[PDB]
Amino acid sequence: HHMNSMALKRIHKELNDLARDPPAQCSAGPVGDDMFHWQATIMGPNDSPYQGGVFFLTIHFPTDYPFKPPKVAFTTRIYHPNINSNGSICLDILRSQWSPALTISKVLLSICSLLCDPNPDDPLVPEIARIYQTDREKYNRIAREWTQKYAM
């Protein structure tokens, strides 16, 4: 017979790799004994208006990982064009551009990259995209305000 544990082995591998080479601002791991449900924490990137913030996420790996992406959501509020009040993240690799070559460390690094470099032309929060496009000084000030309001 078969053992059906290859997703679990992949997730374990990815967890061990994460400990040895952490994406710098980030921690992540299983909530308790369930390897398919993780929590994560992202410290606001230093050259970003989220500096000083601590943002919590949930990660749910599918049973057929790595052949489908993990489902990742923010649980902390953030002022960003691509992350909505439900914590949903608009990031290509979590949708059409997922590859089984990717890993949770790559996903966390890409979220951090998104925090630094929003994609305002593919928004989940259209006002925040508008402010980003038209008045970056205002965007950074409000993003700092919200970091202090919700993420510190």
Swiss-Prot record:
One Gene Ontology molecular-function label: ubiquitin-protein transferase activity
Limits of the UBC core domain: 6-152
Active site: 90
Listed GO CC annotations: cytosol; extracellular exosome; nucleoplasm; nucleus; protein-containing complex
Listed result of changing residue 149 to E: Abolishes histone H3 ubiquitination
Effect caused by changing residue 68 to A/E: Strongly reduced interaction with CNTO4
Protein name (database record): Ubiquitin-conjugating enzyme E2 D2
Annotated source species: Homo sapiens
